[PDB]
Design a protein around this motif. Sequence first.
Motif, PDB file in Angstrom:
ATOM      1  N   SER A 170       0.916  -1.541  -0.135  1.00 47.22           N
ATOM      2  CA  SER A 170       0.365  -0.289   0.030  1.00 47.22           C
ATOM      3  C   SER A 170       1.128   1.091  -0.473  1.00 47.22           C
ATOM      4  CB  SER A 170      -1.075   0.061   1.156  1.00 47.22           C
ATOM      5  OG  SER A 170      -0.221   0.487   2.176  1.00 47.22           O
ATOM      6  N   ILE A 171       0.243   2.547  -0.433  1.00 46.41           N
ATOM      7  CA  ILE A 171       1.371   3.457  -0.049  1.00 46.41           C
ATOM      8  C   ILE A 171      -0.463   4.888  -0.143  1.00 46.41           C
ATOM      9  CG2 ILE A 171       1.183   4.636  -2.943  1.00 46.41           C
ATOM     10  CD1 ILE A 171       2.898   5.363  -2.766  1.00 46.41           C
ATOM     11  N   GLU A 172      -0.137   6.108   0.441  1.00 43.18           N
ATOM     12  CA  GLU A 172      -0.341   6.413   1.338  1.00 43.18           C
ATOM     13  C   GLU A 172      -0.324   8.390   1.442  1.00 43.18           C
ATOM     14  OE1 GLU A 172      -1.845   6.858   5.790  1.00 43.18           O
ATOM     15  OE2 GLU A 172      -3.788   6.249   4.716  1.00 43.18           O
ATOM     16  N   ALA A 173      -0.366   8.741   0.489  1.00 45.04           N
ATOM     17  CA  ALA A 173       0.186  10.588   1.256  1.00 45.04           C
ATOM     18  C   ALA A 173      -1.274  11.501   1.975  1.00 45.04           C
ATOM     19  CB  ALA A 173       0.351  10.457  -0.696  1.00 45.04           C
ATOM     20  N   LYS A 174      -0.616  12.329   1.819  1.00 43.74           N
ATOM     21  CA  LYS A 174      -1.531  14.175   2.748  1.00 43.74           C
ATOM     22  C   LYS A 174      -0.790  14.463   2.874  1.00 43.74           C
ATOM     23  CE  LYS A 174      -4.017  10.863   4.586  1.00 43.74           C
ATOM     24  NZ  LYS A 174      -4.743   9.955   6.708  1.00 43.74           N
ATOM     25  N   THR A 175      -1.167  15.962   2.281  1.00 43.70           N
ATOM     26  CA  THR A 175      -0.703  16.903   2.829  1.00 43.70           C
ATOM     27  C   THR A 175      -0.713  18.159   4.149  1.00 43.70           C
ATOM     28  OG1 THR A 175      -2.361  18.434   1.528  1.00 43.70           O
ATOM     29  CG2 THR A 175      -1.103  18.132   0.559  1.00 43.70           C
ATOM     30  N   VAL A 176       0.254  18.041   4.864  1.00 46.31           N
ATOM     31  CA  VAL A 176       0.346  17.964   6.132  1.00 46.31           C
ATOM     32  C   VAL A 176      -0.431  19.657   6.966  1.00 46.31           C
ATOM     33  CG1 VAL A 176       1.055  18.097   8.554  1.00 46.31           C
ATOM     34  CG2 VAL A 176       1.509  16.358   7.048  1.00 46.31           C
ATOM     35  N   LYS A 212      -4.501  23.599  -0.216  1.00 40.03           N
ATOM     36  CA  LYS A 212      -4.800  24.371  -1.330  1.00 40.03           C
ATOM     37  C   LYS A 212      -3.792  24.813  -2.329  1.00 40.03           C
ATOM     38  CE  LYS A 212      -9.139  27.160   0.978  1.00 40.03           C
ATOM     39  NZ  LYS A 212      -9.432  28.021   0.869  1.00 40.03           N
ATOM     40  N   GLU A 213      -4.479  24.388  -3.763  1.00 39.86           N
ATOM     41  CA  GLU A 213      -3.109  25.056  -4.239  1.00 39.86           C
ATOM     42  C   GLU A 213      -2.697  26.171  -4.469  1.00 39.86           C
ATOM     43  OE1 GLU A 213      -5.051  25.970  -8.172  1.00 39.86           O
ATOM     44  OE2 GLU A 213      -6.551  27.267  -7.108  1.00 39.86           O
ATOM     45  N   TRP A 214      -1.156  26.160  -4.297  1.00 43.24           N
ATOM     46  CA  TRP A 214      -0.468  27.132  -4.414  1.00 43.24           C
ATOM     47  C   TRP A 214       0.035  27.738  -2.779  1.00 43.24           C
ATOM     48  CZ3 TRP A 214       2.288  26.188  -8.789  1.00 43.24           C
ATOM     49  CH2 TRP A 214       1.283  26.041  -9.310  1.00 43.24           C
ATOM     50  N   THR A 215      -0.897  27.249  -1.796  1.00 39.83           N
ATOM     51  CA  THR A 215       0.278  27.145  -0.457  1.00 39.83           C
ATOM     52  C   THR A 215       0.906  26.134   0.152  1.00 39.83           C
ATOM     53  OG1 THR A 215      -1.707  25.823   0.395  1.00 39.83           O
ATOM     54  CG2 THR A 215      -2.619  28.308   0.180  1.00 39.83           C
ATOM     55  N   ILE A 216       1.663  26.805   1.275  1.00 39.77           N
ATOM     56  CA  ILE A 216       2.818  25.685   1.586  1.00 39.77           C
ATOM     57  C   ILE A 216       2.663  24.758   2.590  1.00 39.77           C
ATOM     58  CG2 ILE A 216       5.309  26.184   2.288  1.00 39.77           C
ATOM     59  CD1 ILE A 216       5.068  28.885   1.972  1.00 39.77           C
ATOM     60  N   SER A 217       3.013  23.266   2.053  1.00 36.99           N
ATOM     61  CA  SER A 217       3.222  22.415   2.989  1.00 36.99           C
ATOM     62  C   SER A 217       4.070  21.111   3.267  1.00 36.99           C
ATOM     63  CB  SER A 217       1.454  22.089   2.592  1.00 36.99           C
ATOM     64  OG  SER A 217       1.371  20.610   3.321  1.00 36.99           O
ATOM     65  N   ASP A 218       3.807  20.328   3.698  1.00 42.40           N
ATOM     66  CA  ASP A 218       4.834  19.391   4.145  1.00 42.40           C
ATOM     67  C   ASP A 218       3.599  18.181   3.434  1.00 42.40           C
ATOM     68  OD1 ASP A 218       6.333  20.443   5.157  1.00 42.40           O
ATOM     69  OD2 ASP A 218       6.086  18.950   6.982  1.00 42.40           O
ATOM     70  N   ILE A 219       3.954  17.500   2.896  1.00 44.90           N
ATOM     71  CA  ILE A 219       3.689  15.966   1.899  1.00 44.90           C
ATOM     72  C   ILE A 219       4.191  15.058   2.318  1.00 44.90           C
ATOM     73  CG2 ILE A 219       2.956  15.038  -0.071  1.00 44.90           C
ATOM     74  CD1 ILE A 219       3.536  17.433  -1.418  1.00 44.90           C
ATOM     75  N   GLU A 220       3.154  14.703   3.302  1.00 46.74           N
ATOM     76  CA  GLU A 220       4.055  13.508   2.941  1.00 46.74           C
ATOM     77  C   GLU A 220       2.647  11.776   3.094  1.00 46.74           C
ATOM     78  OE1 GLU A 220       2.685  12.896   7.941  1.00 46.74           O
ATOM     79  OE2 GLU A 220       3.706  13.975   8.536  1.00 46.74           O
ATOM     80  N   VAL A 221       3.973  11.233   2.824  1.00 44.09           N
ATOM     81  CA  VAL A 221       3.826   9.597   1.946  1.00 44.09           C
ATOM     82  C   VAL A 221       4.672   8.988   2.113  1.00 44.09           C
ATOM     83  CG1 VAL A 221       4.097   8.929  -0.812  1.00 44.09           C
ATOM     84  CG2 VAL A 221       3.716  10.723  -0.274  1.00 44.09           C
ATOM     85  N   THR A 222       4.124   7.829   3.086  1.00 42.02           N
ATOM     86  CA  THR A 222       3.970   6.376   3.264  1.00 42.02           C
ATOM     87  C   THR A 222       3.907   5.614   2.649  1.00 42.02           C
ATOM     88  OG1 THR A 222       3.654   7.456   5.526  1.00 42.02           O
ATOM     89  CG2 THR A 222       3.452   4.672   5.440  1.00 42.02           C
ATOM     90  N   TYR A 223       4.425   3.984   2.097  1.00 37.97           N
ATOM     91  CA  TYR A 223       4.966   3.144   1.236  1.00 37.97           C
ATOM     92  C   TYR A 223       4.963   1.766   2.504  1.00 37.97           C
ATOM     93  CZ  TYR A 223       5.867  -0.329  -2.335  1.00 37.97           C
ATOM     94  OH  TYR A 223       5.931  -1.909  -2.401  1.00 37.97           O
ATOM     95  N   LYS A 224       4.461   1.282   2.452  1.00 35.33           N
ATOM     96  CA  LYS A 224       4.548  -0.434   2.517  1.00 35.33           C
ATOM     97  C   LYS A 224       4.875  -1.624   2.004  1.00 35.33           C
ATOM     98  CE  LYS A 224       1.654   1.614   6.609  1.00 35.33           C
ATOM     99  NZ  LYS A 224       1.352   1.167   7.791  1.00 35.33           N
ATOM    100  N   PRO A 225       5.900  -2.279   2.155  1.00 35.99           N
ATOM    101  CA  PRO A 225       5.571  -3.952   0.928  1.00 35.99           C
ATOM    102  C   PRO A 225       4.766  -4.283   1.265  1.00 35.99           C
ATOM    103  CG  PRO A 225       7.787  -3.089   2.318  1.00 35.99           C
ATOM    104  CD  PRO A 225       6.703  -2.439   2.751  1.00 35.99           C
TER     105      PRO A 225
END
Length: 124
Positions: A4-10, A14-27
């Motif tokens: 699985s894999i999962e992504a969030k903007t933390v 919204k477009e053009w604003t600043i954020s961390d992006i966390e993406v977690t992949y588990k095999p």
Amino acid sequence: QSASIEAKTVNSTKEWTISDIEVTYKPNAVLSLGAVEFQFPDGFHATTRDSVNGRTLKETQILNDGKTVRLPLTLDLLGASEFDLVMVRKTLPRAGTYTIKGDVVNGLGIGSFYAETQLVIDPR
């Protein structure tokens, strides 16, 4: 069975604003040979300031104009049940849905491993 894999903007969504992006992949399976790979489309850009499992990425793990992150399974990675990628204070791209992918490449070649997910950026 399935990786699985999962992504969030933390910090924001919204477009053009600043954020961390966390993406977690588990095999969801045991790993020994190959390399873990995250694939982004355009609008995302990894740099050597971003990190996986607490380690800043190296130039050799970033390819494809920043859209691809490929991590040979060294000892530090082999321990791990999951691969937590963090993109630091990114400007988010235009509103839409975006497919972000994970896989294990250059492995034995026998296995599920592919996985993918949709990250949604909202209107301004």
